Amino acid sequence: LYFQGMLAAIWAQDEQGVIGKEGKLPWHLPNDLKFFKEKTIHNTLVLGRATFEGMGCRPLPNRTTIVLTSNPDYQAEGVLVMHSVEEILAYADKYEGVTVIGGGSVVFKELIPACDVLYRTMIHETFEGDTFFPEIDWSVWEKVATVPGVVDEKNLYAHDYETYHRND
Ligand SMILES: NC(=O)c1ccc[n+]([C@@H]2O[C@H](COP(=O)([O-])OP(=O)(O)OC[C@H]3O[C@@H](n4cnc5c(N)ncnc54)[C@H](OP(=O)(O)O)[C@@H]3O)[C@@H](O)[C@H]2O)c1
Numbered sequence: 430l431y432f433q434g435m436l437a438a439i440w441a442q443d444e445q446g447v448i449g450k451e452g453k454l455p456w457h458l459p460n461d462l463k464f465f466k467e468k469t470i471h472n473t474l475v476l477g478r479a480t481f482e483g484m485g486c487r488p489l490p491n492r493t494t495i496v497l498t499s500n501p502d503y504q505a506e507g508v509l510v511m512h513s514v515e516e517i518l519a520y521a522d523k524y525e526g527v528t529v530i531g532g533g534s535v536v537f538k539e540l541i542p543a544c545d546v547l548y549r550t551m552i553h554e555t556f557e558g559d560t561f562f563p564e565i566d567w568s569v570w571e572k573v574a575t576v577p578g579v580v581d582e583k584n585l586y587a588h589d590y591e592t593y594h595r596n597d
């Protein structure tokens with residue numbers, strides 16, 4: 430499922446629902462970033478400011494990044510800056526590809542009801558962090574695929590890649 434104008438949400442979480450430690454990933458799992466890379470290249474990536482800043486304000490190459498903030502004067506290295514959910518949606522509608530929500534928690538909670546696809550990496554382990562995937566309405570979502578992740582010297586944690594589509 431990959432239509433133009435589509436909104437998708439992508440995240441990685443541990444078994445507790447931890448998605449971040451003060452903007453940072455509390456684990457290292459190179460395969461997940463690869464998965465992230467695949468779903469976001471040549472698309473638009475939407476980030477809340479805290480998440481953006483946890484990435485050192487560095488935009489990722491080969492895609493458009495939108496950063497969401499209420500601060501009218503916020504500016505940063507080579508990203509679109511937008512200031513409301515409504516702004517994200519207007520952009521998403523006209524965009525020639527997928528608008529992918531990359532986080533963080535606040536952004537996920539308010540934008541996932543507009544999304545058509547969920548991509549999640551479930552990491553079967555627990556870590557310390559302060560940011561959790563939010564409570565959402567799962568009743569409207571349906572798991573349509575799941576792939577186990579490869580474990581090797583570089584990837585030390587059992588994990589799964591899950592895709593959900595909507596009921597309606
Ligand atoms: N123990 C605790 O205190 C605790 C608990 C949970 C999280 N936190 C923390 O909160 C951060 C990450 O949480 P998060 O994942 O929710 O952050 P995030 O989604 O990545 O980004 C949050 C920010 O994006 C903005 N934003 C979201 N919706 C907007 C809208 N509709 N219009 C305009 N701006 C909007 C805001 O920027 P602006 O602020 O510039 O308006 C907002 O504060 C971390 O730095 C972390 O340490 C701490």
Ligand SMILES: CCC[C@H]1c2ccccc2C=NN1C(=O)/C=C/c1cc(Cc2cnc(N)nc2N)cc(OC)c1OC
Nearest residue numbers: 439440441452453454461462463465466483484531532550
């Ligand atoms: C993979 C090599 C490096 C690089 C990159 C370079 C060139 C081309 C593509 C990419 C793809 N992204 N790249 C990143 O460093 C990873 C991005 C990233 C993302 C997320 C969010 C995320 C994380 N994971 C998931 N599943 N959802 C997500 N929504 C969080 C991060 O830190 C807080 C990230 O940086 C560590």
